[PDB]
Every structure is written in structure tokens, then in C-alpha cells.
Amino acid sequence: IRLGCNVSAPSGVLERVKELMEDYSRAPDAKFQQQFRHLLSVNFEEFVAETKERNADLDWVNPKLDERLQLELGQRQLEENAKKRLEARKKLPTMKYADDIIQAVRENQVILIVGSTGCGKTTQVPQILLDDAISRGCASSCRIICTQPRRISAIAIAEWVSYERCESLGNSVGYQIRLESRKARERASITYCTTGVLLQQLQSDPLMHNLSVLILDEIHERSVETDLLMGLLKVILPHRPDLKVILMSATVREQDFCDYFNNCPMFRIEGVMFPVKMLYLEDVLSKTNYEFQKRMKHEAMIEPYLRRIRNSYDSRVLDKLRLPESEGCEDIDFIADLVYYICENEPEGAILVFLPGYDKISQLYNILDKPKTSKGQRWRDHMAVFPLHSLMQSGEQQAVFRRPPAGQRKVIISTIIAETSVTIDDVVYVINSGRTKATNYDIETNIQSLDEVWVTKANTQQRRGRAGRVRPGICYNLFSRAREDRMDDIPTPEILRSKLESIILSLKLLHIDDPYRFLQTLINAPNPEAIKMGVELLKRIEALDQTGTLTPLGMHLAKLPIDPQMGKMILMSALFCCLDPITSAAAALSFKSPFYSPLGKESRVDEIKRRMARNMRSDHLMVHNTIIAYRDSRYSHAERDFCYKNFLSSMTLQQLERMKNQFSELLYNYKFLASSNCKDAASNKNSEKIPLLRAIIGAGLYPNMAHLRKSRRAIHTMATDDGRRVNFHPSSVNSGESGFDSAYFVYFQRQKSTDLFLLDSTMVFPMALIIFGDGVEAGVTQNTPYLCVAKTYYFKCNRETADVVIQLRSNLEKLLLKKALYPAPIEENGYEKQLIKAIELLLSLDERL
């Protein structure tokens, strides 16, 4: 055992804390307390009974609305804005199956519609069922909900379906995504929403009584949400016989889903795309004649293959296949040469180049823009080159989607972002490197890594479709068909890679109290050891007790649309009057950073974040000052100038703001704040006290701690609480910085790519960890009295201070339990506030002189 710095407090401070705690300790309507006890006392069958009675709206029908919409449909099918658009609808394949689909839905609770891009299932199926219900005189009974994995898709589909019915958004078709909705009319309607929206609505309507038809789309993507939803349908459907479910899938392991709901009927609907030619690396080198130079297990792979193709290819091209750099994207000039090849032959169209990540996108961009070969210099000013990356601004401009200047060919250098997330319509040629990046969590080492991996056959096939949009295209896969036969079918289902605390918590409100048994019923069951690891995190933050049952605090956390650790932080910031900065850190960790990382500008982006951090040594506070500065740029009509100069996405900033107001309104509605405004003065009287904000941040990210021991840019000898050597990620504001006031940091995410990095960190002080953490004891080890936290970091601390901080933790634990059970804003001149001031007092001792 080593011993850290001294955290004993001056006697004058200790005795005012003693007086304050003693005033807290002379203290003597709860709707929330009844709801919480009611949830624990019900078994599942009485839970099912009660939800049925509380959600009964669709038990009511309006016959004059039934008959009036029945009439209006019949007449506007004689009209001529329809009767054009219905004969374009019937050119889509799905419409040929309308009647068989209507009948299969009537006879079966669950059906499955399998179709490729262009089949029209997503636009046409909901209309087929709705129009059928209106025609039969049943309009008011029908409420269709159709999920999508992505936000942009939900809106765009909804706007298109509304165009196909000659309606502005919001009468028969609507959408609903997080914090944005053009809601459809109540009945005889179709709504598109992100899968997560409907998961959040389950809390209020856990057996889906408020919809007559549920359609799940793109389930083949094996999103966490759709894998979760299908688990819950096996729980829900046996108590909802009148509910219809229509699963929808691409032709990607379609049979897994039909197997899963036990053999239910399955339609396969033809696609409409242009044919796209697949060439593998055999064919590319046979056509480009490129020449290379500047384990294996490659040749066990490549040589059996090279000889069932003896007579189909030249000798010299197959000698290139034996070089391990031939495949993938190890040689970027090879990729640059094939861009140059397509530019000369192979008539007009855009080139879409898939590379794994930021690093190789930068290389090929520099090669295409600062070419060193004569072939490239000819081509430099006849290409329009766009990098495409979630951290880059190109996606949020209109240029990459439009058609290039005359005489120039557009070339897009992109990550997997362009497979489904982003769609560009004039692409004719796909260069598929076959490599992307993926995050892999090892449960043994508790190390998450970001590694370069091969794509799956499902990826490769999606990328080939990206060329068949406007006209016949070509896909060049820079790997052999020997490499493809060693690719997996699909990527690892997202649920087996996910942290589970937040799912386990959400389930408790659906009265699914055993997560080991329930999660085992999913199409791919997560490892039970990951469930244990999720449950124990939840017991550590006291959302569950040691028998594993939900606690009043845990029920609050489960209703907040955010992972439970950062929920706890948001609630603490309500009780400790620092709401605005902490909701900002919370939103940024839940969603994204607002900073772009544009090519070539990495050194200038580093300086912008050091400037925005205001030397406060925290990536989290750094985000909040970004929001503060953003607000002032709108108050001054300098918004885009501000965003241009500092490489900020206004779109990410405005969303982060709507998340902060959504946390504020929720906390207000749960009776933890007096005002729903996250800028309210009463809610923010401590928002300028920096040592107090690092305490709240640590309360949320605990127990992810690290300790620094080195100097010199500077090099850092730092290790996390488990002993493993770490550094700050170079994107972090603490990367390379020297002269820290404290050697301790908390972090949200640790990750291995070249080294073991902390992606984000805030410098914390020992006394704040001790107050809000756990694993706290007082003792003596050498002849010195100590006070520890996590029984990992031990600090010199005299006994008079130790006895008070331990006493102070005890009262803070009793305060938190009661605020969770009997939520009320903490009154500004009451008993509870005296305890808060005691903690403020202790924490202020670490302020900068």
C-alpha cells in the first residue's frame, strides 16, 4: 500500500460541517411511493390485468368516422391526383401481393415479409392494411405503427407515404422520433418511428394495447432494439390475440426470424434494382495490371484457391494474389490506381470508395488531391473528392449528394457510413476494400478494443446494391473469392457486444424481473456473465438492492431515456443545483461530441478544444462551455461564424440542447426540480463552482478512475484503478497536458487501439470521490491515519476529518434514499439544504487559488 496526498480539513471547516449536519439531523404527499410499492406487490398476471384496464382507448370505435372515411376514400380514388399515383404504386412488386398479405394477416398473428431494396414493402404494406380497414368500414379501429432503425429513414418514408396519398404530413401518415414528431391523426393512421421510441412507450403501455398493427422493419440488421422487441413479443402476444405483427426483413439470414416465431408464414417479394457487376481481386488486377512494392495462414488460404483458377487467369496476376498486401487496403496507391483506371475507361458516374476509418480515408484523399504520380496529376483537377465520415462535415452539406461539375467525376471516400446511413444517388461504381472497424469487448480483461476487421458477406452485398440505383453499375472487391468464403454471413448481432445495465433496468418496469431467464430467450442470447456484470453495476449505483429488486432510485433511472449512471448524475445535479452544466455533460456522453474532425485540420481542432476547455482539465466541462458559447453566438446573430471558426456542428448542438430540455422537463415532472428550464436560476446556483461540478461528474462516472504519476507535450505514466497502464486519447483535452492540480481522473470510456486510451476524462479531487464513492474506511497503516476510497486509493487523513466525512456520507445516504422515495425540490431554506451546504463547504477547499 502506497499513500496519497493529505485530505484533512481545517478545524474551522470541520466544526461548521458538524453544525450543518446536526441541523439536517433535527428534521421530522407521496404519489411516487405508492406507485413503487404497487409495482413490487403485483405478480405478472395482475400486472397484465391492470395494464389492460388502464389502456382501453382502442376498445372504442366511432361509426360515423368509419363510414365517413369509407366514403371519402371511394370518391378520391376517382379523383386524378390519385389514380395516377396508384398506378405508380402498382408498378412496385409488393402491390401485386396485396390480397395474399391482407389474408395472411387476417389468419395469423405473426407474418414475415422478406424483400430486397426496391420491393416497396416499407411504403406499401402499411397502406395495404390501412386502406383495407377503411374499405371494410373499420377505419377507426386501425392504428398502424411501423418502426425503423434510423431517424432519417423514419421521416423520409413518412413524407413519401404522405405524398402517395395526396396529404400533407400529419393526417393519415405521421412520424415520431426522439424530440421531433409530426403525429398522425389518432385513428385510421400509420406512424413511422425509431424502434427506441416504441421501446420507451412500453413503460406506459407494456402490452401494446394502443396499436392494432405492429410492423417491425429492417430486423435483419439485428439492432439491439429489434432483437429486444422480438423477445418481448413472445411475452406480449400470448395476452394480445387481436394484435397483428408483421416482421420485415431483407434477404439476409431471413430464415432465422421465421424459425424464431415458430414457423410463421413468409412472403418473398422481388426487388427492383439495376444489375451490378461483381469483380474480385483476380479480375481487378487482370484489368488494371498494377504492380506492388515500396501470419500466413494467407497462403494456406490463397494457394488452394489459386489453382482451381489456373486456366481462367494470367500467370502474373495470380502471383500478385500471393502478396498479403494485395487484399484489403494495405496499399492505398493500389486503390488510387483503380480510381484512376475507372476515370479513363468505364463511362460517366460517381465513384464510392469504402475504407475502414478516418486514418485510411485521409491517406487516399491526400493521394487523390496531392498526387505524386503523373497519372494522378492529370486526374487531380478532373475529380471532385469528398470524404464521408460521421465526424466530418461532408454529410451535413448538400454538395456530396448533388451531381458534380461538368467534366469532373465525383469520388467519395467513406466509412461504413455510406452502406445504409447515408445514401448518394448518382454513384455508379463501388470500390469495396472489404475492411471496416468494429468494437469488441472482452469480458475477461474488461478491455474494449477498436480493431480493423473484415466485412461480412451481408456487408459486401449491401455495398453492391449502392451502385444499382440509377443505372447498371460495377463493384470492385479488393479481395479474392477465397477471402469471401472465409467471411461470416452477418456481423455479430449488436446485443452480444452491448453493455446490459440499461436493458436490465428497463425490463424491471415491464415486470420482467429475471434478466437471466428473459435475455436467454432472445434470438442470440447474450452471455449470462455479461448479465451478471450488468446487474452488479446496477447494485453498485444502488438502482437495485442486493436481492436484486428495483429500488426507488432505480425506478427513476429506468424512466430517464439515458443510461443509468448518467441518469444518476443528472438527478444529483438537480439536488445539488448544478443542472445546466451536468445535463450538458450527460447529453454529450449519451449522444456525441459536437466537434467535427476535418481532414488536415487535426492540429487546429486540438487548439479549439483547449480554448473551449478554459484550462478546466475536463472533456465534459469542455462540452458545456461549448454550449454556453454557442448560445451567446445565437444571442449575437453570429451563429454560423461561430460554428465555422470552431469546427462545430450546429445540428449536433441544437440536438444536445433539446436533450437537455428533455432531461429538465422529465426531472420537473418527477418533482425533482421547481422549473422545467435547464437554465433556471434556482436550479443553477452552484453551476459556477467548478470543484462542485467535478464532484457531480465523478458521482456518475464512478468507479471509472485513473491515477497519473508522470511529467515532461508531456508523456504520462498513468494507470486505471485496476492497475493497467493507460494514456489519454489524443482527442481528449487532457492529452499531453502538464501541470494538473490533481492526479486523479474519471472517465466514461476506456478503449484499446494502439494503446489503452481513455476517450474522455475529468480531473477529480480525492475528497469528492470519497464523499460520493464507496469502499470508504478509516484506518492506520504505517503509523499514519488514512482514509480510502474503493479500498484502492488511500489518502493521509487525520481522524477528526475522517470521523466527519464518514458521518457525512451516512447522512448523504439517508438524504438520497428519501429524495428518491418522496421526490420534492430541495427547498432553499430548509433542513435538507443544510446538508448540501456541508458538502459544498468541504468540496470548495479544492478550488484554484
Next chain:
DNA sequence: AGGGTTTTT
């Protein structure tokens, strides 16, 4: 000294 991608009444 480095950043695959979604998403939450």
C-alpha cells in the same frame, strides 16, 4: 499522438 455506426413517450 488518433476517432466503425446506430438510438431513447
